[PDB]
Amino acid sequence: SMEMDEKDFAADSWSLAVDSSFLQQHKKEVMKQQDVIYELIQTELHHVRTLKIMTRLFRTGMLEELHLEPGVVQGLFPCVDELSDIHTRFLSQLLERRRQALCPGSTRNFVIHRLGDLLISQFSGPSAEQMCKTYSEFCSRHSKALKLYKELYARDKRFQQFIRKVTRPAVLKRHGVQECILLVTQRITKYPLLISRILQHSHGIEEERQDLTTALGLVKELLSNVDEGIYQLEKGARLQEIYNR
Amino acid sequence: AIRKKLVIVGDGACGKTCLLIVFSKDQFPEVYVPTVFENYVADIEVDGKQVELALWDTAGQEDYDRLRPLSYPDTDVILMCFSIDSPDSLENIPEKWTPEVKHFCPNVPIILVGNKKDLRNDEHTRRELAKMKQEPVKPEEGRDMANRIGAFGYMECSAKTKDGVREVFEMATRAALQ
Ligand SMILES: Cc1nccn1-c1cccnc1
Ligand SMILES: Cc1nccn1-c1cccnc1
Ligand SMILES: Cc1nccn1-c1cccnc1
């Protein structure tokens, strides 16, 4: 992540991120809504950062330092460039909505009143089709990636030294290779939980309540399609084992 | 330190997310209780042994039968949760959660955990449950379910007051080490 965004999302909540004199000007219901919107953006910023650790620290580091057989790095990090493009673009839209809402003279005081339309756009049309195709591919390659990682760590000395080196810093404690893969798989199922709680506090404007209800429905349709499109790939699996599923 | 992995499973209203949040922060948040839990790696020292215990939640995966099992690879200990204010969450333990965990995590110890124990003597909870001819889960009902499903053990906690929370994770670390 970049320092400007990390500082804007360093606080545990929206109520602690804004100035107390600004917080005091809002009703409790607005504060509850803003705290959940802030958590959605903060966790999206962290999710994009997990994808950057996968692409820049692990993937590119292996290509530039190690002598792995072709197709091995892609097997460890399936779809990471596509996933990074989807979420970096989504994160850009969320952060621009916050930036437009800032009060003049402030870099921290804002209220986002219209999130629903942005979520409907993300979870409909071509961007939803790309999310569905990419997560169906990623989640079907998840078990294979973990097994390839374990095999390489147990048998390749230079691979083990590389992993221990780049995961040594305290800031990588939660972000080893296997931890990154499960963090990405689990991201998509966090969206309905966050959207439902934002909706619970967005009844004040009927257009907003309707837009968040539509967005929640689109996210659930996407998840159902992804879930129905998954079948774990296994290295060396035989056709007979596949057609006898 | 040796690395171990913990996964918590249970119905949507069982309190698993709150339990992970309270343990990982060592506090019931005073300003904002997070909606979700990403992951955490706890440094735990139990009975003289140092362990890095990676913590994972299955919240949000309850309706997705092909995504949910992706949380299980290489799990060392399972916390199987139910809420004491929800006798319905306990009924789904033996024939939904237990066969799934035994299939994907063979030979992994399961600790059955009764969450929200503070609601057992809460008048509002007793009134709401009495309308459906129900009462908060009794301690013997939790122990009998744990015995029946082949659990490593039975424990209770309250994320709200923090009571019993440290003990659950220290025992989970001992189970993962065996
Ligand atoms: C006083 C305060 N500072 C940050 C948040 N809050 C707050 C406001 C209302 C209820 N609870 C906490
Ligand atoms: C490989 C594995 N270990 C535990 C569970 N799984 C698994 C199997 C099939 C689909 N998803 C996850
Ligand atoms: C195959 C499967 N997917 C999700 C859960 N299960 C399951 C359920 C019961 C027993 N064994 C596996």
The torsion angles phi and psi of B45, rounded to 5 degrees, stand at -120, 115
Alpha-carbon dihedral A192, A197, A201, A207, rounded to 10 degrees? 0
Phi/psi region, residue B37 (left: phi>0; alpha: psi -120 to 50; beta: rest), is beta
DSSP state of B94: I
Closest by Cα among A65, A91, A73, A58 to A172: A58
Shortest-distance ligand to the CA of residue A28: 1
List A residues 25-54 in contact with B (Cβ-Cβ < 8 A).
35-36, 39, 43, 46
B9 in a labelled binding site = no
For tokens 């409909």, the residue is A124
Residue B17, C-beta contacts closer than 8 angstroms, at least 6 positions apart: B34, B35, B36, B37, B57, B59
Number of domains comprising chain B = 1
- Cα–Cα distance, A214 to B3 (Å, whole number): 42
Q: Output the CA torsion sign for B24, B13, A43, A100.
A: negative
Rounded to the nearest angstrom, the distance between the alpha carbon of A215 and the centre of ligand 1 is 29
- Look up residue B54 and give its DSSP letter: E
Q: Domain segments of chain A: what residues? A: 1-245
Checking chain A for breaks where C and the next N are over 2.5 Å apart, the residues before them are none
Residue of A138, A186, A195, A225 to mutate, interface with B, max B Cβ within 10 Å: A186
Could you give the CA distance from residue A44 to residue B85 in angstroms, rounded to a whole number?
Answer: 33
Nearest to A179 among B34, B36, B39 (CB): B39
> CB of A11 closer than 6 A to ligand 1?
no
Q: Is A221 on the interface with B (CB under 8 A)?
A: no
Q: Which two tokens stand for residue B53?
A: 């215990």
Question: Hey, is the C-beta of B66 within 8 angstroms of any chain A C-beta?
Answer: yes
The H or E element containing residue B7 is: strand B2-9
Q: Identify which of B159, B125, B168 has the alpha carbon closest to the alpha carbon of residue B34.
A: B159
Resolution of the coordinates, Å: 1.5
Q: What separation in Å is there between the alpha carbon of B99 and the centre of ligand 3?
A: 7
Q: Which residue in B has a C-alpha nearest to residue A197's C-alpha? A: B35
Cβ of residue B12 closer than 8 Å to a chain A Cβ: no
Cα dihedral A102, A105, A108, A113 in deg (nearest 10) = -20
Task: Give the largest CA-CA distance in chain A.
Answer: 68
Mutate to test the interface with A, among B38, B43, B74 (most CBs of A within 10 A): B38
CA of B101 to the centre of ligand 3 (A): 8
Are A139 and B67 within 8 A, CB to CB?
A: yes
Number of the ligand 3 atom closest to the C-alpha atom of B68: 4
Method used experimentally? X-ray
CATH number of the domain to which B108 belongs: 3.40.50.300
Amino acid making up residue B82: F
Ligand nearest to the CA of A178: 2
Cβ–Cβ gap A193/B60 under 8 Å: yes
Cα dihedral A214→A217→A219→A221 (10° resolution)? -140
List the single residue in A with minimal CA-CA distance to B53: A174
Contact B29 A185 (CB under 8 A): no
**Sheet containing B40-46, strands listed edge to edge, beginning at the edge strand earlier in sequence:** B40-46, B49-57, B2-9, B77-83, B110-115, B153-156
